[PDB]
Amino acid sequence: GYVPEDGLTAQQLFASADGLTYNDFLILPGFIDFIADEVDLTSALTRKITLKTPLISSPMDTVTEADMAIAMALMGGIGFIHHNCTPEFQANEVRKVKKFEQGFITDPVVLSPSHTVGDVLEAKMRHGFSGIPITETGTMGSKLVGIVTSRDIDFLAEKDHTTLLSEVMTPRIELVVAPAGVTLKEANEILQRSKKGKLPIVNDCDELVAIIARTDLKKNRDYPLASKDSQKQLLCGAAVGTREDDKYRLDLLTQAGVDVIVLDSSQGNSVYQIAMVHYIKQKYPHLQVIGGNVVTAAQAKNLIDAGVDGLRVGMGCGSICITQEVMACGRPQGTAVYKVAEYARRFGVPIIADGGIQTVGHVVKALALGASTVMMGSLLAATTEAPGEYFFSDGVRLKKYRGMGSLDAMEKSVKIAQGVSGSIQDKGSIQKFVPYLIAGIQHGCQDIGARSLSVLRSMMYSGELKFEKRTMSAQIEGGVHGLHSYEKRLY
Amino acid sequence: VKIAQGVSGSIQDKGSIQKFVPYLIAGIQHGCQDIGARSLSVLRSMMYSGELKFEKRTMSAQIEGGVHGLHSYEKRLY
Amino acid sequence: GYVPEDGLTAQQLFASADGLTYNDFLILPGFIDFIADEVDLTSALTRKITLKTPLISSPMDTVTEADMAIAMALMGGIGFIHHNCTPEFQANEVRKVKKFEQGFITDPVVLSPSHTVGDVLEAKMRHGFSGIPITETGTMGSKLVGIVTSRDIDFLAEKDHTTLLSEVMTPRIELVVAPAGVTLKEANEILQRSKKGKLPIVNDCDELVAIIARTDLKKNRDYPLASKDSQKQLLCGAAVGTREDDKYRLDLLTQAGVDVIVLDSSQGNSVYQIAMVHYIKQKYPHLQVIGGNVVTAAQAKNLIDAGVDGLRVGMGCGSICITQEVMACGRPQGTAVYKVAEYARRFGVPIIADGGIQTVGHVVKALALGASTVMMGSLLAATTEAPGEYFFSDGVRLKKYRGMGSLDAMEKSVKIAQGVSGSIQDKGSIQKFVPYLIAGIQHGCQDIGARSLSVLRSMMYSGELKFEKRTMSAQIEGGVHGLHSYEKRLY
């Protein structure tokens, strides 16, 4: 009882070949012994950061500001906030991602009893929340005198500046508290049992040292996949360039609490980028660096030698990109992902496959070819969390989608354009769309017979995972064909 | 979370199966005849023995083998 | 000194390959030592028929009836008259081609002196000419009593009904004549010196044996390339099927004086076709037979063994054709032409490359690959000489272009359609368009460095002629590209 070997290994697929794209090949089906829902999508972003989902939103001005980065992190991916903005704007976007979910809030909004209901309303306007502990100084480290929330100031008619907070607080005698040096789980038990919405943390001197909010425990149960640091804040990435003024931007982003930096370049194998990696790794040794838009092992070597914690793979793929028709330079993305990942895995360096991801099948191909994570631009553009506003043109709801080497982006929003500037049709919310991509990746892995992305890659490197090349007519046959009209209702 | 594996489309009218399947039958018979096969059983035996020969097509052979070079046409099958 | 070898030989181009079309390759340029106008286009149609031009009009109901066949023969090609018509209609189309140019007219229209001016006008209405010798019987072999022409009946208004020809003729006393047994060249000298428009040929008994017309000497100087038989009539081809009733059609076409028969089939390697070739070669040993739409040497063998004088090459190419998507069956035409011609040349059997000829570059490729002649359907459709009438549809002057297995042709104009009943935009006259194709073939051969189609084929078989295979992007680069609009003003 024997059956002959069928299809190519990945090593065979890229050996006797020109550069393949994701469209040029299929994965052959395996054996299914498991449910798609039990497929593990745990992914290394860098040497020290693991995501529950392989998915990254690209650092583009039409893709990733704070709402996208929050939504991606809540879905168990991450967002890298774009750098086509002032350093102060970018750091404020990073701060919004880091403030959205909290363990101990150690720098809350605080007011004095001498402040007013108008000051609580203006605080709610600036920071988005009404739950404000009150201390004698109105600064964080002071003796606690009460707590003010929206239930204390709501349905007061108009006496805003007229009313001092001392008359409006829940006074410190009435408030439930925990001692300093309580663990987060112990503070959560106290808060959960108290049935209150805030729990202040106070030392033996009765002065405020932290506070915790019930809404973060709600965000816990609401978002099981969420990408969080050790102090339970969302993970945030940010882009920086490799110019000297990017050192100032990097300092603002690091004090804003950014977890990972991506060095943003067309061609990352440069003296400028290697110098920036060395500068970061000496000044901020805690900070993860993804360097390198690279497409060859020779480029990957120089950045792994410089000490990057991850690599970005792709050049001239990417929906919006024209680098290949402007510089002659790049690689077919499936070949680039395979070549760079097969090399970078020897050093324990994870790969991000960046650009040309049009479909969830392309995500499964990128992951199968050795990418540990996948970065999307246009596939997440025209979601609700993507920056800017919808418009109508051809009777179609469209959002702008620009590209960062677009000459319109380079107006600080001879110079050479490396991107066009375009539009994409509406997609709805990341919070529904990323669960569709997750379940699509799981069903892809299931048809392949892989229980996780880790076993999927090991099946690929051992040659258990088999591939078939597609003729152009196989790419037609594998697409929608032969119909008059069709309705591509994904999820 | 509820993964679609197909789209939903439309196709133009074809008429009855009781006329269309006799057209497919006769097309299969004419294909086998141009090939020199008296039955689908002998067609498969010619294929496995290597008597049946195939040629690969470039994309331009797929263009040349279709309708080409016309302003418009009328695909009046049966 | 030395220069390295560049490009593939034809043997290499088809060896390590899938089936190529004409679009899939180029011919590499040679050395030019001659003018394009001195490129010899002399072509074998069959073992015994040589044309001055490689060009054939296809036997289709929307391409070749008598006007097309006359025009093709005058341009030094040939037409094959289609068979999707009654045997009597097809033989009458052949008769029109054979009557258009004459050496000795040995079966002229003749009248009695007791016929009338009205009988001469009715004769002119039926046969197209007014020059009618008069014999006392009104039958050919009888005593010459005079000659009547249009200048004799000219401007006789309504005197038609009862004016006997006796008083209208130029009488036999006045007419210039030649003796029987005069050569055509000698009769032409007598006619040319006489300054008359007819010269009757009479025996010593003074009875009519032939006549010659000055208009045939005019047709001589007007058409230097013209394809003529030994008695100076135009060459005509005709199609026939291989059914039993085609034996009757073949008898009508042979007594109408057809020079060459083409056996019309999608797949000519059949017992039915081999039987028809044997039947023709025993019943009509003078008659040239082109058998075989064939695409392999194995098919060609059986018809060359049956005794065909030429082969048609092509299956499922052809603008109008759907045989491949209806029968799975055929071959890429460049490969078919090369394979069959390289085999058939060993037996001295010429090849017609039939169908898929969209451009004069495809003609040069077909001839370079070993075709001795090229047959066109759609490229000659919507010329003025093509059958039927023009119409307008999309604001475009169109003519119908049908195909012979199409389901509109097979209604005597379960049935399986092998063609698609379409339309082609106007091209103007064959008498202008074929000189353009001739000049294009000559400039193709000149860029290649071939002084004739015979040396072109010899350079191909010796491997002196080099080919380069084309990517799809070379086919884009080789076409019109990068323009907003263009005007393809050929000739």
Ligand SMILES: Nc1nc2c(ncn2[C@@H]2O[C@H](COP(=O)(O)OP(=O)(O)OP(=O)(O)O)[C@@H](O)[C@H]2O)c(=O)[nH]1
């Ligand atoms: N106050 C607070 N407590 C948190 C937060 N995140 C987690 N915790 C607490 O720490 C525990 C951690 O266990 P899990 O919930 O299994 O792991 P997690 O990765 O931290 O959170 P999930 O995102 O829900 O998976 C939770 O039960 C909470 O009590 C947060 O943002 N704020």
Ligand SMILES: Nc1nc2c(ncn2[C@@H]2O[C@H](COP(=O)(O)OP(=O)(O)OP(=O)(O)O)[C@@H](O)[C@H]2O)c(=O)[nH]1
């Ligand atoms: N109150 C408060 N919440 C903060 C602060 N910084 C971040 N947050 C987060 O914002 C959220 C507060 O949620 P809630 O407790 O529902 O908000 P609230 O304070 O009651 O204010 P309202 O919803 O406006 O009534 C939690 O996820 C907090 O972690 C801060 O200084 N104070």
Ligand SMILES: Nc1nc2c(ncn2[C@@H]2O[C@H](COP(=O)(O)OP(=O)(O)OP(=O)(O)O)[C@@H](O)[C@H]2O)c(=O)[nH]1
């Ligand atoms: N009456 C007549 N004489 C002809 C005809 N064709 C040729 N001739 C005569 O034969 C001569 C030989 O002509 P050529 O030019 O050598 O060769 P051809 O193929 O016969 O004629 P072309 O068609 O002009 O090439 C001409 O000069 C005429 O005198 C014809 O159709 N009718």
Ligand SMILES: Nc1nc2c(ncn2[C@@H]2O[C@H](COP(=O)(O)OP(=O)(O)OP(=O)(O)O)[C@@H](O)[C@H]2O)c(=O)[nH]1
């Ligand atoms: N006259 C004549 N010409 C014939 C006959 N059969 C074929 N033809 C050809 O038709 C053409 C006759 O041309 P002309 O001599 O110009 O015709 P015509 O006799 O002057 O008559 P009109 O043109 O009507 O004045 C020549 O090419 C002949 O070879 C026939 O029976 N009689």
Ligand SMILES: Nc1ncnc2c1ncn2[C@@H]1O[C@H](COP(=O)(O)OP(=O)(O)OP(=O)(O)O)[C@@H](O)[C@H]1O
């Ligand atoms: N730790 C606490 N101990 C006692 N009272 C508290 C405490 N935290 C908040 N309060 C008081 O409880 C009331 C509700 O505040 P809480 O944070 O629980 O809900 P809220 O977020 O304001 O309610 P809601 O979501 O409906 O707007 C207010 O009067 C507030 O001052």
Ligand SMILES: Nc1ncnc2c1ncn2[C@@H]1O[C@H](COP(=O)(O)OP(=O)(O)OP(=O)(O)O)[C@@H](O)[C@H]1O
């Ligand atoms: N061989 C001949 N000998 C003498 N007269 C002739 C001869 N052939 C024709 N004719 C006469 O010559 C005259 C002109 O006839 P011919 O054939 O030469 O020209 P046509 O074709 O009739 O002239 P056109 O082209 O102008 O219409 C007529 O009267 C005719 O009867």
Ligand SMILES: O=c1[nH]cnc2c1ncn2[C@@H]1O[C@H](COP(=O)(O)O)[C@@H](O)[C@H]1O
């Ligand atoms: O202007 C540009 N030129 C070249 N590459 C760009 C430009 N802007 C963004 N990119 C790349 O394109 C990727 C997104 O590609 P997409 O997912 O196919 O739309 C980004 O993550 C970048 O790597």
Ligand SMILES: O=c1[nH]cnc2c1ncn2[C@@H]1O[C@H](COP(=O)(O)O)[C@@H](O)[C@H]1O
């Ligand atoms: O109905 C048909 N089906 C298949 N082949 C046809 C049919 N009618 C004509 N042909 C072929 O198509 C050739 C003309 O092709 P074309 O020059 O490309 O237009 C003819 O000479 C025939 O060999």
